[PDB]
Amino acid sequence: LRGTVTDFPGFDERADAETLRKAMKGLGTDEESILTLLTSRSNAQRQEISAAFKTLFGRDLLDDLKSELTGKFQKLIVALMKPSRLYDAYELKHALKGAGTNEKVLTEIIASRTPEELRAIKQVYEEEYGSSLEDDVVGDTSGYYQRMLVVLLQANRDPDAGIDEAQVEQDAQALFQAGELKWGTDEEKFITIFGTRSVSHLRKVFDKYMTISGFQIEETIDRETSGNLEQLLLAVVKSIRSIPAYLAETLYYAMKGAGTDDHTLIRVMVSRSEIDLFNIRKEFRKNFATSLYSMIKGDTSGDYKKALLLLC
Ligand SMILES: [Ca+2]
Ligand SMILES: [Ca+2]
Ligand SMILES: [Ca+2]
Ligand SMILES: [Ca+2]
Ligand SMILES: [Ca+2]
Numbered sequence: 001l002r003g004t005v006t007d008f009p010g011f012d013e014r015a016d017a018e019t020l021r022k023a024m025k026g027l028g029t030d031e032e033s034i035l036t037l038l039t040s041r042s043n044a045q046r047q048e049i050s051a052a053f054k055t056l057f058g059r060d061l062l063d064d065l066k067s068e069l070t071g072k073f074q075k076l077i078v079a080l081m082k083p084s085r086l087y088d089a090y091e092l093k094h095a096l097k098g099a100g101t102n103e104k105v106l107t108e109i110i111a112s113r114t115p116e117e118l119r120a121i122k123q124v125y126e127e128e129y130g131s132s133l134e135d136d137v138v139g140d141t142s143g144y145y146q147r148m149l150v151v152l153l154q155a156n157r158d159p160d161a162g163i164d165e166a167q168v169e170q171d172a173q174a175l176f177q178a179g180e181l182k183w184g185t186d187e188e189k190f191i192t193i194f195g196t197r198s199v200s201h202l203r204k205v206f207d208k209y210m211t212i213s214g215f216q217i218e219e220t221i222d223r224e225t226s227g228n229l230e231q232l233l234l235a236v237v238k239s240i241r242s243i244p245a246y247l248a249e250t251l252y253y254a255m256k257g258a259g260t261d262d263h264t265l266i267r268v269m270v271s272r273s274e275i276d277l278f279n280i281r282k283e284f285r286k287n288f289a290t291s292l293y294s295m296i297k298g299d300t301s302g303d304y305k306k307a308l309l310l311l312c
Helices: 013-024 031-038 043-057 061-068 071-081 084-096 103-112 115-129 133-140 143-152 165-180 187-196 199-213 217-221 228-241 243-255 262-271 277-288 292-299 302-310
Strands: none
Touching: 013 031, 013 043, 013 061, 031 071, 031 302, 043 061, 043 071, 061 071, 071 262, 071 302, 084 103, 084 115, 084 133, 084 262, 103 143, 103 228, 103 243, 103 262, 115 133, 133 143, 143 187, 143 228, 165 187, 165 199, 165 217, 187 199, 187 228, 199 217, 199 228, 217 228, 228 243, 243 262, 243 277, 243 292, 277 292, 292 302
16 A cells, blocks of 8 residues: 655744645635645645644634635645544545535445454544434435444454355355345344455455356456445455555546536545555546546646645
């Protein structure tokens, strides 16, 4: 896992505070200055620039960036400024909050994050927002989608140790028979297989599944659309195989067709900039025969594409 953003060598929080102050101060705004500085500092350095900005000027850097900037560019800079430890929990709170629910952010983050990451997300969510992530998810979702989400939210998959092939055989069968009935009959049985087994066990299951049916499990669950639970099952199957591959694909489908899902583009670009965006880049090129760069550049404009291309 290699990230695309790294600590800037020779950082001076005070110098960077003053540069940012100068870019904003007075009539107008110098976005080029802001943009090139904040995509080359790490998230933790940005936090030190904010601290230093308030000691020197008594102003809040994020409110100033929200006042001075506009549109998708403002959305991206505000996302970059969010402390890394708060961001997935923030995005989770905003998919739940209000009327309806953005199931896409819920599935994405709960299926692509590791048990370590989730233990930490549930802790910072509680701290920050006062309610349990579990109680807000249950407050907002229904049926087996809710159940599988809660199962994944316990952050208790089995450990990667004994490949119990008897259990590999049995679970492969169970999934096969669940596959043919289009993931609509024994939901309890497969929610436990998909949510509770080790990543190594399930990889061996997905293989034996293929030898039993001739094809890949995502083919049967595939309706890359329609039905919350199917969409989650597909996000889990793809993340068991490769989280950088699954994230590269949501990125791809954020730009394919008319429009752009700029919210997903900003969310995956920002949240993974210092975790695995390099690996996601590799996966993108290899699976889609285009680089992430080229697609971003075709699908985005202005200061917002300059900043994205610098984070890519
Ligand atoms: Ca100004
Ligand atoms: Ca300007
Ligand atoms: Ca503004
Ligand atoms: Ca809601
Ligand atoms: Ca498009």
